[PDB]
Amino acid sequence: NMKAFLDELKAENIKKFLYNFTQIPHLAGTEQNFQLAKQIQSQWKEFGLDSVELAHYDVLLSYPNKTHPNYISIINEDGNEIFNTSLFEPPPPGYENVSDIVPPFSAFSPQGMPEGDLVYVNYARTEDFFKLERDMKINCSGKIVIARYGKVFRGNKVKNAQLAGAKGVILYSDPADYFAPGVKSYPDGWNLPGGGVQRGNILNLNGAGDPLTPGYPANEYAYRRGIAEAVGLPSIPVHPIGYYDAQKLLEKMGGSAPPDSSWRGSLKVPYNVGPGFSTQKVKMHIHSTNEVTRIYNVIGTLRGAVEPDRYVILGGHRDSWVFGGIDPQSGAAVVHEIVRSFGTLKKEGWRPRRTILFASWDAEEFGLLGSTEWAEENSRLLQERGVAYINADSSIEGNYTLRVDCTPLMYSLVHNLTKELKSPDEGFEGKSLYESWTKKSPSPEFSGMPRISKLGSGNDFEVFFQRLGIASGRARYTKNSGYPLYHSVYETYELVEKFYDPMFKYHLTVAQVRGGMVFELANSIVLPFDCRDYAVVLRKYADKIYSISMKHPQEMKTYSVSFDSLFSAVKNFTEIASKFSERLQDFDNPIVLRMMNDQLMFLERAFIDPLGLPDRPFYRHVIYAPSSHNKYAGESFPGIYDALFDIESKVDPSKAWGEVKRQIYVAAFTVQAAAETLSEVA
Amino acid sequence: NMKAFLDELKAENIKKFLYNFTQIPHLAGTEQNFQLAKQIQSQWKEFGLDSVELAHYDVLLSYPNKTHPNYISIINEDGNEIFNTSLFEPPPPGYENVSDIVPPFSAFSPQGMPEGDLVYVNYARTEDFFKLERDMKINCSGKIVIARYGKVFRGNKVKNAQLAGAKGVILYSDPADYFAPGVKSYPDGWNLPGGGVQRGNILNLNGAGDPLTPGYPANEYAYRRGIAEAVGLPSIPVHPIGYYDAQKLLEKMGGSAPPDSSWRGSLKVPYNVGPGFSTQKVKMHIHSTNEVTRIYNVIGTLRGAVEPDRYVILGGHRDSWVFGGIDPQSGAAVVHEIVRSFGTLKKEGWRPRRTILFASWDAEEFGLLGSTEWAEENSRLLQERGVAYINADSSIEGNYTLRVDCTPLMYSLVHNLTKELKSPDEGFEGKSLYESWTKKSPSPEFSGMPRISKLGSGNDFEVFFQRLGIASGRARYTKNSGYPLYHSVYETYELVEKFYDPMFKYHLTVAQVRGGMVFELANSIVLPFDCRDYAVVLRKYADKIYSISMKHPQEMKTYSVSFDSLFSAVKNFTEIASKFSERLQDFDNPIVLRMMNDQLMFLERAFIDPLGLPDRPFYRHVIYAPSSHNKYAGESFPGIYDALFDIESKVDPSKAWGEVKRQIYVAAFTVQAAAETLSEVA
Ligand SMILES: *[C@@H]1O[C@H](CO)[C@@H](O[C@@H]2O[C@H](CO)[C@@H](O[C@@H]3O[C@H](CO)[C@@H](O)[C@H](O[C@H]4O[C@H](CO)[C@@H](O)[C@H](O)[C@@H]4O)[C@@H]3O)[C@H](O)[C@H]2NC(C)=O)[C@H](O)[C@H]1NC(C)=O
Ligand SMILES: *[C@@H]1O[C@H](CO)[C@@H](O[C@@H]2O[C@H](CO)[C@@H](O[C@@H]3O[C@H](CO)[C@@H](O)[C@H](O[C@H]4O[C@H](CO)[C@@H](O)[C@H](O)[C@@H]4O)[C@@H]3O)[C@H](O)[C@H]2NC(C)=O)[C@H](O)[C@H]1NC(C)=O
Ligand SMILES: *[C@@H]1O[C@H](CO)[C@@H](O[C@@H]2O[C@H](CO)[C@@H](O)[C@H](O)[C@H]2NC(C)=O)[C@H](O)[C@H]1NC(C)=O
Ligand SMILES: *[C@@H]1O[C@H](CO)[C@@H](O[C@@H]2O[C@H](CO)[C@@H](O)[C@H](O)[C@H]2NC(C)=O)[C@H](O)[C@H]1NC(C)=O
Ligand SMILES: *[C@@H]1O[C@H](CO)[C@@H](O[C@@H]2O[C@H](CO)[C@@H](O)[C@H](O)[C@H]2NC(C)=O)[C@H](O)[C@H]1NC(C)=O
Ligand SMILES: *[C@@H]1O[C@H](CO)[C@@H](O[C@@H]2O[C@H](CO)[C@@H](O)[C@H](O)[C@H]2NC(C)=O)[C@H](O)[C@H]1NC(C)=O
Ligand SMILES: O=C(O)CC[C@H](CP(=O)(O)Cc1ccc(I)cc1)C(=O)O
Ligand SMILES: O=C(O)CC[C@H](CP(=O)(O)Cc1ccc(I)cc1)C(=O)O
Ligand SMILES: *[C@@H]1O[C@H](CO)[C@@H](O)[C@H](O)[C@H]1NC(C)=O
Ligand SMILES: *[C@@H]1O[C@H](CO)[C@@H](O)[C@H](O)[C@H]1NC(C)=O
Ligand SMILES: *[C@@H]1O[C@H](CO)[C@@H](O)[C@H](O)[C@H]1NC(C)=O
Ligand SMILES: *[C@@H]1O[C@H](CO)[C@@H](O)[C@H](O)[C@H]1NC(C)=O
Ligand SMILES: *[C@@H]1O[C@H](CO)[C@@H](O)[C@H](O)[C@H]1NC(C)=O
Ligand SMILES: *[C@@H]1O[C@H](CO)[C@@H](O)[C@H](O)[C@H]1NC(C)=O
Ligand SMILES: *[C@@H]1O[C@H](CO)[C@@H](O)[C@H](O)[C@H]1NC(C)=O
Ligand SMILES: *[C@@H]1O[C@H](CO)[C@@H](O)[C@H](O)[C@H]1NC(C)=O
Ligand SMILES: [Ca+2]
Ligand SMILES: [Ca+2]
Ligand SMILES: [Cl-]
Ligand SMILES: [Cl-]
Ligand SMILES: [Zn+2]
Ligand SMILES: [Zn+2]
Ligand SMILES: [Zn+2]
Ligand SMILES: [Zn+2]
C-alpha cells in the first residue's frame, strides 16, 4: 500500500544519487550525458521496471566555438580593445581539473560583431520598454541594450529588445537580484560571486520543440526546415556576464537618468539609461554555432495490473549546463529513488492498477526539446491514454516551504496527501506538511488553505499540459531572483549539502509528495480528480478578465462587448460538475467505473482547441497558457487577456474590440463544451 | 437478434414515408422544412427512441430575390435584350398549384450584371483549362465562360474559372451527359427535358461548414466573420440553364474550333470554343442575397445497455432543393423505417449494447452545414466516443447494383453482411447480394470480390471522416452524369415509383445494408473492424504514389527523393496489424475487451494530423481527402499527390521537390504512429 511505498524512500539514497549525478558536467549532446543515460537505463532495469528504453532524436543545439571565444569589449576611437569581459568563470575549489565546463554563453545566439552605444533597459520587460519609448522617448534602434537578469524568462527580454530595434543584447546578474543580504559568496555561502555567470537559452519557441521540425518528431527520416525558417531563433547576438564585468560597462553610462528607483540595482553606478557613455563604444564578439546533435531520453515502464492502457507519467530532465547540483540533479536523484522504491514493491509481487512511465528527458535546457519530441512521436497514445503528468525537475529552490503548481483537477489530491505527510520544517515537528505549508504560504483566494499557482511553462510539463491537455502538476521546496547560483559553475553538490539541505530531509519530503501523487493516480480505483475545483477557479478567472475589460467602459458600450456568454458557461459548468460528482458517489460495475474515469481523464482534454491560440498553434489550452511577456508565468483565459493587452494603443479600435468579442465566444464555447463532457453520456 | 431487426423492415412502409416526405418542397431555412423536422421528432418519439431533440444553428444561406429574377440575355450593339433565358422550369403534371418552388439558381453567387464574350470550356475541369491556356492559347480573362455540368463538383468548375480570369460562369446540362439514349423525357420517362435545370451550391468550403464560423458552432452567441472574410464564397456570378436555353447561346459561337471530340456534346452546334460569336454579347443578371437563417437538425438517441458512452451514428439530410424525390427523401424514408424497426425491438425490451444516434441533418444542400455545425459543437464527445458513422442520403441512383464507399476498416463487415442478404436483382433470385454485387461490380484490385471505393466528400460524412477521423461508410443502389433529373423540379415521388423502384425492393435492400451495418456496429461484442484490410490498401496507395513520382526520375536523383520511409512504415503497419489480430483471437476479461475495442475505435483516429493538410486545415486525415479538383472524388495520400501535381510547371524545382519530401515524411510518420496504436499498450 501507499505507506509501504513511502516508508521505503530514504534520504540517504537520495544524497548518494545526487553525489553520483554531479561530479562531471552533463551537457545535452555530449558523450558524458549519453553515458549517464546508459547508466540510468541499467539501474532502472536492475531496480525492477519491466522495460527500459532509450528514445533518441536529432535536434538543433548550440555551442560556443572552442577555438574562437565569445566576449564583449569597450573600444576607443582608434578601435583598440581597452576592456575585455571574462572568458570563463573562476572554478570552485577542487574542480579546477574538470574538463569540459562549457563557458558562459547564450544558447542559440546568432554570430556577429556589433559595435554601438549602450542603452540600459532594466529587466527588459514589456513595461520597461514602454517606459523608455513612451515616457522617456529614448529610441533603442541600432543600439546595444544591456539588461539585468530577473523577473521574466530571458527569451522574452531578447524578443522585446529585438522588437525595439536593438542590435545586440547583453545580460548580466545584478547583485540586487542575485546577492542576498548578509550571506557570503560561494564557496563560503550561497551567493553569486562577481565572476559568476548565468547560462541559458534565449529562444522563443512557443511550444514548438526542436526548431527544425515543429509538429513532428526529429527522427531519422525527418524533413528539416532550413535554419532561416527555424522556429524561435533570435536575430541579434546575445551574451551574458557577471557583475564585476557589468560594473565596468555601466560605470561610464551617460544620457538620461533612471526614471525612478525601481530601475536601480545595487552596484555603485548611476544606472543611467544612456544612450552612450563618450567616444568609447561597445563591441560584441559572438561565434557560437548551431548544430544538429543526437539526444537521448530514457523511458521506463512499470505495467499496470488492471488498466495497462492508462498511463501515469513521472518525468524530469537530466541535462545540465554544468554540474547541475540543484538544476536538475536534485530532481533526478528524487526520481531515481522513487523508481527504486516502486521496483522494490514490484519485486515483492505488487503492481499498480495503471501503468506508470518514468522519464529522464534530454535537452530540456535548450528548449524542452527531449520531452517535446517524444510527445510529438507518441501523441496519439498520450492523448487517448494519458491520465496525468507529474514533473520532477529540482526538488529545492530554498528551504522555507512547499510550492505546488497544478491543474485544479489535482487540488484535492494534494490537500489530502499533504495532511498524511509530516513536515520537516523546524518548529513543526509532529505537525503535518499541510499545516506548515498553509501557515507559511496561505491562499490569497480565501480560506485556511495553502496557495497553489497556475502552470505556465519553462519546464517539461509544457507539451503535456498546454499542447495535449493532460492533467499535470509539480512540487518543490522553495524560499520565503530564483536562487543566486542558478546555471553557474558554482551550482555543485557541495552547495546543496552544505547550505540547502544537509540532512536531505527536504529532498525526502518532496520525494514523498511527488511519489505519493503518482501512487494515488496510478492505483486509486476512481481517479483522484475533483471537477468541482475547476468550477470554482473558472469563476475567479472570469471575474478577473471581466475586471480588466471594465477599464474600458466606453468601448464596451460602443462595441457591445458582453461577457454574458462566458458567465453562463461557467454557471453551467458549476451545475453540471455538481451532478457528476453526485453520480460519482452513487454507482457500484466496472464499465460504469471505466466510463466515469474516462470522463474524468478527458475533462482536461476538453479544454484543448485544435486550432490553437492566435499566432501560437502549439499552445492549445483555452484556460491556461504561458504569459506572452514571461514564459515562466501562467496566464488565465490567455486568448482574451492578450486581445485586451495594450488595446488602447491599437489603431483600429473596432477591429481590436471585434477580436476581444471573438475570444469571449471561443472561451464561453469551450467551457460549455467541456461541461458537456461530464453530462450523462446518453 | 439481427434477423428480427431485418425482418421487421417493410418495403411498403418505406414507400409511404417517401410519399409523405415529397408532396411539398423542403428547402433549408423555410418553414416547410421546420415543420417536417417537428414531424420527424414526434414520430421518432412515438417509434420508441429514448430522447429526440432539435439542434438549431444560425448559418449563412442564399436565396433568389422574389421581386427581381435572375436571368441571362443575349444583347445586340444597342443594348437591347434580344434573347432572355427562362425564369422557371415548366412544372410537372399535377404540381402546377404548388407554391414555393425555388427557381433555378446557383446558391452563394455574388450579385452582378457582367456582359462580355463567351468562351466554352467543356466541363471546366482543371485539364480543360490547361488545354485552353497551354495548347490552344485562349485567354479567358475578362470573358464569361460557359461550361457543361458533369464529371466534377460544380464548385470546382467555378473555382477553376475564377482562377482563369473569368468574370461570370454559366452552367448548363448537356443532353450527352443528362439524356440517356432511347428513353423519354419526364413525365413519360426519366430523362431531363430541355427546360429542366440543376440547382446547386457553388462554394469551395474545404470542410469549413458555415462560412461565417469556421471551427466553432453557429450558435446564439457566435462571433461571425464579415461576409468579405467568409470562407469559400465565389467572387464571380454564376447561373445554371437548361439545354433549350443553352443551344441559343452556343449556336452562334465562333473563334477556335473544339480541340477534339471529347469537347463536343450532343446538341446541334459546332461546340466552338470562342471567344465570341459577332457584335452581340452575353449579359447576366444576378440578384440573389446571402442571409443568416436558422436551420434545424433532429437528433434521436437509443441508449446502449452495456456501453452507453460508445456512439454509433446513422445520419442523412432532410433538406431538398425542391421535392427531393430521390435526393434526399429516398434516403430519409429508409432511415425513418430503420428507426421504426429499432424502436419496435426496444418496445419488446431489447437494447443495443452501444448507443445509437440517428440524425436528420439540415442545410446539407448548401454545403453540409447542419452536420458540420453539430459536429463542431459536439467534437469532444465524438472524438473520444465515436465508433462509426453510416451516412444515409439517397438509396438509389439507378437500379443495377450495389455501390459501397467506406473505410477499409469496414470492408470485412460489408462482405459478411451482404452474404447474409438476398439479392433483389432480376436473375439472382435465391442468390446473395454479395453474389450479384460481385458479378456486376468486380474489384479491379484483384480477386472474386466486389469493388468498394474511397470516401471523398459531397455528403454529410465529411466532418466525421476527414475532420474527426471516425470510421465511416455509405451504400446505395446505382446504375451500370449522375441521374438525369438531379436537383430539378422533375425529381418527384412519381419518378421513383414509376421508373426507379416500383416495388420498393431496392430501397428495402439498401435499408437492410444500412440497418445491418448499424446493428452489427452497435451490438457486436468485439468491434467489427479488420485492421489488416487497412494494411493491404496502404500498400496499394504507396505503390500508386510512388509510380506517380517515378515519372520524374531525374528530379528524384537530383533532389534525393526517397520513398523508403513510407514503405518501411507500411511494412511495420502490416506486421503490427497481424499481431494485434492474433491477440484479438486469443483473450477471454472485459477490460481487456474494452482496451482492445478502444484500440480498434482509435485506429481511424490515428490518421488525423491536427495541423491539417496544406492550406486546408479542416481536412485532417492523412490517408484520404477530397480531390482538390473534384470534391466528390476521394484521393489517397492527398498531401503527396498535391505536392506532385503539375510539378513540372513550378518555377523553383528545389522548393517543389522539398515539399514532396516533406509530405513523404509526414505520411510515413503518421502510418508508423497509427501502427503503434495497435502495439501492446505496455
Ligand atoms: C447554459 O445552459 C443553458 C441551459 O440550461 C443554455 O440555455 C439555452 O440558452 C439558449 C439561448 O442562448 C436558448 O435559446 C433559445 O431557444 C429558443 C427555441 O425556440 C428560441 O426561442 C430562442 O430564440 C429566440 O430568441 C432569439 C433571441 O435573439 C431569436 O434570435 C430567435 O430567432 C428566437 O426569437 C433561443 O434560441 C436555449 O433554448 C437554452 N436552452 C435550454 C434552456 O434548453 C445556455 O445556452 C448555456 N450557456 C451556454 C454558453 O451554452
Ligand atoms: C519500422 O520498424 C523498425 C523496427 O522494426 C524501425 O527500425 C528502426 O530503424 C531505425 C533507422 O530508421 C534504426 O535506427 C538506428 O539506431 C541505431 C542506434 O545506435 C543507430 O546506430 C543508427 O544510427 C546510426 O546510423 C545513422 C545513419 O545515418 C547515423 O546517422 C547515426 O548517427 C548512427 O551512426 C540508427 O539510429 C532503429 O534502431 C530501428 N529500430 C529498431 C530495429 O530497434 C523503423 O524505423 C520503422 N519504420 C519507421 C518509418 O518508423
Ligand atoms: C555512479 O554510480 C554508478 C553505479 O553504482 C557507477 O557506475 C558503475 O561503475 C563501476 C566501476 O567503474 C562499473 O563496474 C559499473 O559498470 C558501473 N555501472 C553502471 C554504469 O551502471 C559510477 O561509476 C558512479 N559515478 C560516480 C562519478 O561516482
Ligand atoms: C480528500 O479527502 C476527503 C475526505 O476523506 C474526500 O471527501 C470524502 O470522500 C468520501 C469518499 O467518496 C465521501 O464519502 C465523503 O462525503 C467526502 N467528504 C467530503 C466531500 O468532504 C475526498 O474525496 C478526497 N479527495 C480526493 C481523494 O481526491
Ligand atoms: C405525413 O404524415 C404525418 C403523420 O402520419 C401527417 O401528419 C399528421 O397530420 C394529421 C392531420 O393533419 C395531424 O392530426 C397530426 O398532428 C400530424 N402528425 C404529426 C405532425 O406528427 C402528415 O399530414 C403527412 N403529410 C402528408 C403530406 O401526407
Ligand atoms: C467475417 O466472417 C468471417 C467468417 O466467419 C470471420 O472470420 C472468422 O472469424 C472467426 C471468429 O473470430 C475466426 O474463428 C475464424 O478463424 C475467422 N475466419 C477467417 C479469418 O477467415 C470474420 O471475423 C468476419 N469479419 C468480421 C465480423 O468483421
Ligand atoms: O526553454 C525553456 O523554456 C526553459 C529552459 C530552462 C528551464 P529550467 O530547468 O532552468 C527552469 C527552472 C528554473 C529554476 C528551478 I529551482 C527549476 C527549474 C530555463 O533556462 O529556464
Ligand atoms: O456542398 C457539397 O459539398 C455538396 C452539396 C450537394 C450534396 P448532394 O446531396 O446533392 C450529393 C448527392 C448527389 C447524388 C446522389 I444519388 C446522392 C447525393 C451537391 O450539390 O453535390
Ligand atoms: C571556429 O572558428 C574558426 C573560424 O571559422 C574555425 O576554427 C571554425 O570554422 C570554427 N568552428 C565552427 C564554425 O564550427
Ligand atoms: C582584448 O582582446 C583582444 C583580442 O585578443 C586584444 O587585442 C586586446 O588587447 C585585449 N584587451 C585587453 C585589455 O587585454
Ligand atoms: C528610432 O531611430 C530610427 C533610426 O533611423 C528611426 O528610423 C525610428 O523610426 C526611430 N524610432 C522612432 C522615433 O519611431
Ligand atoms: C536554510 O534555512 C535557514 C533557516 O531560516 C535559512 O535562514 C537559510 O538561509 C536557508 N538556506 C538557504 C540557502 O536558503
Ligand atoms: C429585391 O430587389 C429589390 C431592389 O433592391 C428590392 O425589392 C430589395 O432590395 C431586394 N431584396 C433583397 C435585397 O433582399
Ligand atoms: C428580356 O427581358 C427584359 C427585362 O424584362 C426586356 O426588356 C426584354 O424585352 C426581354 N426580351 C425579350 C426578347 O423578351
Ligand atoms: C489575359 O488577358 C489579360 C488582359 O489584360 C492579360 O493581362 C493577361 O496576362 C492575359 N493572359 C496571359 C496571356 O498571361
Ligand atoms: C430499371 O431496370 C431496367 C432493367 O435493366 C433498366 O433497363 C431501367 O433502365 C432501370 N431504370 C432506371 C431508371 O435506370
Ligand atoms: Ca519536432
Ligand atoms: Ca461553424
Ligand atoms: Cl518540477
Ligand atoms: Cl449515402
Ligand atoms: Zn536550468
Ligand atoms: Zn531544470
Ligand atoms: Zn443534392
Ligand atoms: Zn443529398
Coordinates of C-alpha atoms and ligand atoms in Angstrom, one line a residue, chain B residues 210 213-214 216-218 373 376, ligand 18:
Chain B
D210 CA -20.9 27.6 -42.1
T213 CA -18.0 30.5 -38.2
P214 CA -15.1 28.1 -39.2
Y216 CA -17.0 26.8 -34.0
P217 CA -20.7 26.1 -33.9
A218 CA -23.0 28.9 -35.3
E373 CA -22.0 22.7 -37.1
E376 CA -18.2 21.4 -34.3
Ligands
CA18 CA -19.2 26.7 -37.7

